[PDB]
């Protein structure tokens, strides 16, 4: 619970938190994403996708283009630090990543890459 967070994406196209802080002393960090609400993945899909603020736009744009079967993520996208898969209602998914992939003083953003969603479905992550 020191090195992990629980996040929900619902049918209102929103995350239930908008800022995550990763403690420097964590060796690894975990995000658990769940999808309450009742809409299917093809219509209201949420992933939890992490990049630098600088790369967010590019990741969203290219993810948009890659289609549903690719979880709206460009395959092998180098800008994606960590991601869950794309989930629909009733589903849940985890991602654990090495905290050493982060550095102090850089601004990270987490976002959903289902088309259109990142407008509302974004938040900050920073390494303290």
**Residues placed in the known binding site for Cu cation:** 46, 112, 117, 121
Q: Which is nearer to Cu ion, 20 or 112 (CB)?
A: 112
Residue 46 near Cu ion by CB under 5 A: yes
Cα–Cα dist 114/96, whole Å? 21
Binding segment toward Cu ion, per CB under 5 A, in 28-36, 43-51, 74-82, 94-102: 43-51
Residue 117 near Cu ion by CB under 5 A: yes
Residue 114 near Cu ion by CB under 5 A: yes
Q: Decide the pairing of beta strands 28-34 and 4-8.
A: parallel
Residue of the chain from 50, 56, 87, 112 that contacts Cu ion (CB under 5 A)? 112
Cα–Cα dist 37/41, whole Å? 11
Report, in Å, the least distance between residue 2 CB and Cu ion.
27
CA distances from residue 56 to 38, 47, 122 in whole angstroms, order as listed: 28, 14, 10
Residue 111 near Cu ion by CB under 5 A: no
Report, in Å, the least distance between residue 111 CB and Cu ion.
9
Report, in Å, the least distance between residue 47 CB and Cu ion.
7
Give 37's strand partners: none
Beta strands in the chain (DSSP E): 4-8, 19-22, 28-34, 49-52, 82-83, 92-98, 108-111, 122-127
Give contact residues for Cu ion (rule: CB under 5 A): 46, 112, 114, 117
């Amino acid at each position: 619970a020191e090195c992990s967070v629980d996040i929900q994406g619902n049918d209102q196209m929103q995350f239930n938190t908008n800022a995550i802080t990763v403690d420097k002393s964590c060796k690894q960090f975990c995000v658990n994403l769940s999808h309450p609400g009742n809409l299917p993945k093809n219509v209201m899909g949420h992933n939890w996708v992490l990049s630098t603020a600088a790369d967010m736009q590019g990741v969203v744009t290219d993810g948009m283009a890659s289609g549903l079967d690719k979880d709206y993520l460009k395959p092998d996208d180098s800008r994606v630090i960590a991601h869950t898969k794309l989930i629909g209602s009733g589903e849940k998914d985890s991602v654990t990543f090495d905290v050493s992939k982060l550095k102090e003083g850089e601004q990270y953003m987490f976002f959903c890459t289902f088309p259109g969603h990142s407008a509302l479905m974004k938040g900050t992550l920073t390494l303290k």
